[PDB]
Symmetry: C3
Subunit: 141 residues, 3 copies
Amino acid sequence: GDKPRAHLTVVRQTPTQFPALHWEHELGLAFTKNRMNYTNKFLLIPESGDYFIYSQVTFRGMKPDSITVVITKVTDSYPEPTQLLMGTKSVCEVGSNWFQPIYLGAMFSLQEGDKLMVNVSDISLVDYTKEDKTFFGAFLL
Amino acid sequence: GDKPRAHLTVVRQTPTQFPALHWEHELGLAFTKNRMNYTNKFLLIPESGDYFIYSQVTFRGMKPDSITVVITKVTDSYPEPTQLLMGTKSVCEVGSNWFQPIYLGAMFSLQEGDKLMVNVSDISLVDYTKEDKTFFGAFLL
Amino acid sequence: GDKPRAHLTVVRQTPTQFPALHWEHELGLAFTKNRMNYTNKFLLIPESGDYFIYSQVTFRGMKPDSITVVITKVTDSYPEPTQLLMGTKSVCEVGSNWFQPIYLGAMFSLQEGDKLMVNVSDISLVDYTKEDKTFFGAFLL
């Protein structure tokens, strides 16, 4: 039916302690629909329910011991953000022209009013060049 | 509607030839609902249908040539367990303080009575510290 | 209800510039149903809607700087294929008996008539030995 859904895709990040990524939400393959609202680097949840949520962040060098992606839920009532999913990968070679994707997806019970965001260990390692490499989405099941 | 669904999260494993993991099923972000039953290290399927099933296992050193996760289906009638999904990754450096996630998810037609579990090549390499790093879930589509 | 769905699993590829993989569609764990049609290395979409689409390709050595999987949409009207998802991973050791999975999944709005395929940087590195290691699926949400 009309289930809230969104697919967001990476853009060049505007420089600003795991910083949140900000996203493309309507151009190319990105979109939000059915009351799903992308606002202020958050996906804002319109309807309480169980959602499948996912993200891939491709990292590329050009030093760090590891790279990490975390998908986080912020709730109006609760002060502290809740980590939903964490992908952390220690990084192997010196140099270098390495690259690598960290993908995560799972199902969570969310409340109307919740806000989701994706944080990374190092924004300058995020590959922003292409909407098919780094993305973030969620849909009511 | 009321579709069977469960998200399970890692706990410290109680020591016991690809051993099955056992899981948190109700505390923090974990849950089972709509007839989904977590029992005896299995997710037991209440209703025949097509399910999306997924798991991430984060591994960390502190030797092994590789690390492997397998999601397996046990069926009452059939004797032999069926491997649904396998993620195997050869491991790179000596030492060491490496870590790394293996994520897998896909859709399968399951029968009422089926049991799913997650096995790993080495339980002592599984990072159990955090519910957002190692998890296992399934939902009727 | 009757939502188009398919899970496809790897086979040995018949030798034929990111070549498309061809798949098992009915034996073992593979299947197509509800008007989903696997034909000519494409999954052909019967009904316009939002789909979750996913693939894992396990690569194994036995040289390449990196390995890449791309899931692509071909549309009747548009000439150029659209890359939906790309997983690219630089490969680490010399030799060698390395292996490694690249997993990708996300949601896309598709039109009736669309065709999806999976391309890889090097078909000869794809591990074809087992239906649980390399697979490709899609379901209408």
